[PDB]
Design a protein around this ligand. Structure first.
Ligand SMILES: OC[C@H]1O[C@H](O[C@H]2[C@@H](O)[C@H](O)[C@@H](CO)O[C@@H]2O)[C@@H](O)[C@@H](O)[C@@H]1O
Ligand SMILES: OC[C@H]1O[C@H](O[C@H]2[C@@H](O)[C@H](O)[C@@H](CO)O[C@@H]2O)[C@@H](O)[C@@H](O)[C@@H]1O
Ligand SMILES: OC[C@H]1O[C@H](O[C@H]2[C@@H](O)[C@H](O)[C@@H](CO)O[C@@H]2O)[C@@H](O)[C@@H](O)[C@@H]1O
Ligand SMILES: [Ca+2]
Ligand SMILES: [Ca+2]
Ligand SMILES: [Ca+2]
Ligand SMILES: [Ca+2]
Ligand SMILES: [Ca+2]
Ligand SMILES: [Ca+2]
Ligand SMILES: [Ca+2]
Ligand SMILES: [Ca+2]
Ligand SMILES: [Ca+2]
Lengths: 151, 151, 150
């Protein structure tokens, strides 16, 4: 009977919440975040070696930036450009040299290697950095790079 | 019948979100945000020339700080004071000298000019900065000022 | 038709719950910590006690006030991450030797380093927490990491 009115009432609160949430999300991502589809990149704004970077992201309930399409890569590139610091991706070929995988162990479904890469320089480049131009380069995991997590 | 129970269950989930979100709004706005009415100012925490500052805000889905009332201007001032750095506003008289407009092209509905301003010093001041005392001054767009966006 | 509107409302709420949960993770990284119903967040810079206290209150919160081992460990994470000791909210400004919260009540938990509090130089009324989580009374005029709780 009057249930129709409890429906409309709830409709109002939900919609006011949707509106405030949309506003607060835009505010949240400025200036250190970028959303693309259902994924959100956020940079910590400082550099760390791979192991440390990876730990910061996992402990925060996410993982290191893992661009899976050209659209995701471009979104990530924006933060790298904004900070003017190359960043680590999540992917490594530590298990089997030459075969880059995501943290889950799955093979890459997208790549944006710079010309000549990956080249395993010095016989010891198992992590991946993304440059300000959005291209990728395998690099030693001990180097320090911008920390960007995805959620 | 069962529809009544469903609506009641949603009401409880909504209440939970509302309370939880209320807390996160405060957390998020600390220390670089300022809420006033339905507007939110947030500083990027660094300085840029007007053109770069404007692009940052627009690409983030907002625009440069545009106080439209004394209340908004006072809220913006609080951030500026806290960061101890003058900030750009969105408004310019780049189109017609002496006529300041918002990015939308509409004339100012509020202003807080320091005495004697705007004065187009050197014949080349088309942007606007807000001081820590909350007053406005027209200024060369090439200068670097604190980036504060509104959402 | 009411049952169809309820279904749409159900969808909206499930979507909001999922988005809010994702958003919380984003907000807390890298400067916040959630413990129980409390959230610590660092401003990422240092200030003297009075200015730090003002920043927190103006933002609708207060300075870090760990009231249990669990809260202290969470706060400790931010301190370690920034590698900067932080001010707590508590002081014995009113009565030497009796530390109190901003409300005025006495401490209900403490984690003092060995030998502390010692009012060194006869003038230490504020509290700092080290990277090791232990507390030391310290001069309020020193500059320490600002960490608020909400
Ligand atoms: O240091 C490992 C790195 O060396 C080479 O790249 C270097 C240089 O040639 C490049 O111009 C700059 C800018 O990209 O980076 C390094 O200084 C390459 O062999 C590269 O594959 C390798 O990872
Ligand atoms: O330099 C442009 C600026 O010059 C004059 O303002 C001076 C001073 O009075 C102001 O407080 C500071 C603020 O940064 O700038 C100058 O030092 C005025 O002519 C002013 O209108 C003008 O924009
Ligand atoms: O007066 C400041 C402070 O001095 C002493 O503590 C110092 C040092 O002894 C400790 O190793 C480190 C711990 O990280 O803290 C200070 O640097 C103590 O006398 C202490 O009570 C006092 O507040
Ligand atoms: Ca290898
Ligand atoms: Ca390799
Ligand atoms: Ca390489
Ligand atoms: Ca002009
Ligand atoms: Ca002018
Ligand atoms: Ca001027
Ligand atoms: Ca004393
Ligand atoms: Ca004392
Ligand atoms: Ca002491």
């Amino acid at each position: 009977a009057s249930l129709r009115q409890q429906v409309e009432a709830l409709q109002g609160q939900v919609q006011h919440l949707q509106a405030a949430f949309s506003q607060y999300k835009k505010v949240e991502l400025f200036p250190n975040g970028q959303s693309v589809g259902e994924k959100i990149f956020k940079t910590a704004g400082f550099v760390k070696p791979f192991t440390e970077a990876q730990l910061l992201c996992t402990q925060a309930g996410g993982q290191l930036a893992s661009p899976r399409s050209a659209a995701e890569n471009a979104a990530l590139q924006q933060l790298v450009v904004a900070k003017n610091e190359a960043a680590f991706l999540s992917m490594t070929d530590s298990k089997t040299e030459g075969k880059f995988t995501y943290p889950t162990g799955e093979s890459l479904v997208y790549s944006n290697w710079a010309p000549g890469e990956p080249n395993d320089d010095g016989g010891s480049e198992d992590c991946v950095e993304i440059f300000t131009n959005g291209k990728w380069n395998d690099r030693a995991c001990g180097e320090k790079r911008l920390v960007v997590c995805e959620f």
